[PDB]
């Protein structure tokens, strides 16, 4: 909040995608939760404590949706709620500093995080529902529909595995693979089959492979992939220190999580990493965002021949899915892959609080540990919003400026972000004008929303020094 620090995007900022999100998408998400709760009830006993508790949650969700529609003031969490649902104290502190804010004129970042907190308090109050994930039906459904791409990537892992081992025993072929797995991780479900369909080293190196990468990369308007490459290849070559730690601050479950696992597996098998740590959400959050249990659901899905019908176990497809699931379990057992959750990730705090200054809500604890990482990969749009504080930076703002203390407090970071929100920085001169003018043609009055569409992406690096 300094003189030259821009304000955060607000639900009241006229013509922004945040304004549209709050007035239009949020009541849909809550209504979807009511409907999914109804769908779940179909599959169980129609009376008793669990049933009644769920009817009450549905009523409360209905009223909550209407509160957002009526643009009422955001109420604090009661002491009872804080204790039963383990609500961080940060929310009530925020509301004291922002008295009487209402859904119609409130910071987009805080209110969105608050939304999922209010939803979770309803579930945590109800003992038969305290661990239920109201977004899980959707998470599973979306992943189920990714069958084709899932099998293609599993086949690729299995194919590459001997060559990755030889690489580890020693390449610009390794560089091509690095770009592929980074970009597949970046695009998540949106990954075009053109990238995935090349499942052998030969196909990846081929003209077809090159064209697929060039198509992906033409949409990545800031691309610091080479800087991260630099970091991991130098650490691998460094014979003084052996540990190479890579962290993943995660976004969505399912295919995006699968691709992050695939990137981790690739780094581990090639020697570009020796330990990968995954950071997940501790409550159902932003609809699809990974929780610890979503990893185990993914591994179970991979082996589930009703879920992913890869045919008899003997098929190549079934063998490849089973191999990857087994590799995951193996890496978790040996500690090459480790999953963690933390309440910090589901507070309203932006990542300028990933700093020694943040002594109340774990920011300083996480920061001290992340300093030890060779590379912290932040996935997705929400993490990017928290890196940049979700502020109205000019769209050419230097990346180091937008991330505040993260430019200088010893965390080496890489943001992989599909652009799905108004905030956008580090663009070349003139690019925002160019993309806006093209976008404006089919989206009148909304030219600036090119970076809200998910069609463009950025890959942004900072050494933290």
Pair 87, 74: CB distance under 8 Å: no
Q: Is 432 a residue that touches Mg ion (CB under 5 A)?
A: no
Helices (H), 70-171: 79-85, 90-97, 108-125, 136-144, 147-169
How many Å is the maximal CA-CA distance in the chain? 65
Nearer to Mg ion, 199 or 261 (CB): 261
Pair 272, 232: CB distance under 8 Å: yes
Pair 341, 281: CB distance under 8 Å: yes
Query: How many residues line the site for Mg ion (CB under 5 A)?
Result: 5
Strands 375-379, 337-341: parallel, antiparallel or unpaired by DSSP?
A: unpaired
CA dist 111 and 9 (Å) reads 11
Pair 168, 196: CB distance under 8 Å: no
Only one of the segments 5-13, 118-126, 279-287, 403-411 lies at the binding site for Mg ion (rule: CB under 5 A); that segment is 279-287
Q: How far is the CB of 287 from Mg ion (least distance, A)?
A: 7
Handedness of CA 460, 22, 285, 370 (dihedral sign): positive
Provide the 8-state DSSP code for 357: T
Helix, strand, coil share of the chain (percent; to 5):
55, 10, 35
Provide the 8-state DSSP code for 419: -
Nearer to Mg ion, 294 or 327 (CB): 294
Tell me if 50 is assigned to a ligand binding site.
no
**C-alpha closest to that of 127 among 84, 79, 86:** 84
Nearer to Mg ion, 185 or 412 (CB): 185
Q: Is 252 a residue that touches Mg ion (CB under 5 A)?
A: yes
Q: How far is the CB of 392 from Mg ion (least distance, A)?
A: 22
Q: How far is the CB of 143 from Mg ion (least distance, A)?
A: 13
Q: How far is the CB of 256 from Mg ion (least distance, A)?
A: 8
Q: How far is the CB of 112 from Mg ion (least distance, A)?
A: 11
Q: Is 421 a residue that touches Mg ion (CB under 5 A)?
A: no
CA dist 177 and 386 (Å) reads 29
Q: Give φ, ψ of 424 to 5 degrees.
A: -165, 130
Interaction mask 210-249, Mg ion, x per CB under 5 A: ----------------------------------------
Q: How far is the CB of 381 from Mg ion (least distance, A)?
A: 7
Only one of the segments 106-114, 200-208, 280-288, 294-302 lies at the binding site for Mg ion (rule: CB under 5 A); that segment is 280-288
Q: Is 459 a residue that touches Mg ion (CB under 5 A)?
A: no
Nearer to Mg ion, 284 or 363 (CB): 284
Tell me if 224 is assigned to a ligand binding site.
no
Residue 24: other Cβ atoms inside 10 A = 9
Tell me if 369 is assigned to a ligand binding site.
no
158, 224, 251, 327: which one binds Mg ion (CB under 5 A): 251
Q: How far is the CB of 289 from Mg ion (least distance, A)?
A: 4
Interaction mask 281-310, Mg ion, x per CB under 5 A: -----x-xx---------------------
**C-alpha closest to that of 155 among 316, 305, 300:** 316
Binding site for Mg ion (CB under 5 A): 251-252, 286, 288-289
Residues making up the binding site for Mn(2+): 251-252, 289
Residues making up the binding site: 25, 112, 251-252, 289, 381-385, 420
């Amino acid at each position: 909040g300094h003189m030259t620090i821009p304000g955060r995007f607000m639900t009241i900022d006229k013509g922004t995608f945040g304004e549209y999100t709050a007035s239009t998408r949020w009541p849909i998400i809550i209504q979807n939760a009511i409907d999914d709760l109804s769908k779940h009830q179909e599959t169980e006993k129609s009376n008793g404590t669990k049933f009644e508790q769920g009817e009450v949650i549905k009523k409360e969700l209905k009223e909550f949706r209407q509160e957002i529609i009526d643009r009422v003031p955001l109420r604090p969490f009661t002491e009872e709620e804080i204790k039963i649902a383990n609500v961080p104290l940060s929310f009530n502190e925020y509301l004291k500093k922002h008295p009487e804010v209402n859904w119609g004129a409130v910071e987009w970042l805080f209110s969105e995080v608050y939304l999922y907190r209010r939803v979770n308090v309803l579930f945590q109050r109800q003992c038969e529902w305290a661990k239920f994930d109201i977004f899980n039906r959707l998470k599973q459904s979306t992943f189920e529909s990714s069958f084709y791409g899932v099998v293609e990537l599993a086949l690729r892992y299995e194919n590459l595995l001997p060559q990755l081992r030889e690489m580890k025993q020693n390449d610009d072929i390794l560089k091509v693979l690095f770009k592929e797995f980074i970009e597949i991780s970046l695009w998540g479900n949106a990954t075009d089959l053109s990238l995935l369909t090349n499942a052998t080293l030969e196909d990846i190196k081929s003209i077809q492979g090159a064209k697929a990468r060039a198509a992906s990369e033409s949409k990545i308007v800031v691309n610091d992939t080479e800087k991260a490459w630099e970091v991991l290849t130098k650490a691998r070559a460094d014979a003084n220190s052996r540990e190479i730690r890579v962290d993943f601050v995660l976004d969505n479950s399912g295919f995006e999580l699968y691709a992050d696992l695939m990137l981790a597996a690739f780094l581990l098998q090639s020697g570009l990493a020796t330990k990968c740590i995954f950071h997940a959400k501790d409550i159902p959050y932003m609809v699809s965002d990974v929780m610890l249990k979503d990893f185990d659901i993914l591994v179970h899905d991979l082996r589930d021949r009703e879920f992913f019908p890869s045919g008899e176990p003997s098929t190549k497809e079934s063998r490849a899915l089973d191999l990857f699931a087994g590799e995951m379990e193996k890496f978790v057992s040996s500690g090459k892959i480790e999953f963690r959750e933390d309440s910090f990730w589901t507070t309203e705090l932006d990542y300028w609080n990933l700093d020694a200054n943040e002594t109340k809500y774990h920011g300083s604890i996480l920061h001290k540990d992340l300093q030890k990482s060779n590379l912290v990969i932040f996935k997705g749009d929400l993490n990017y919003r928290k890196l940049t504080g979700d502020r109205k930076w000019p769209r050419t703002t230097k990346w180091e400026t937008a991330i505040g203390p993260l430019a200088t407090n010893g965390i080496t970071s890489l943001s992989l972000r599909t652009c799905k929100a108004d905030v956008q920085v580090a663009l070349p001169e003139g690019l925002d004008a160019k993309l806006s003018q093209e976008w404006e043609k089919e989206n009148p009055g909304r030219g600036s929303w090119w970076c809200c569409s998910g069609k463009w992406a950025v890959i942004c690096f900072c050494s933290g020094i």
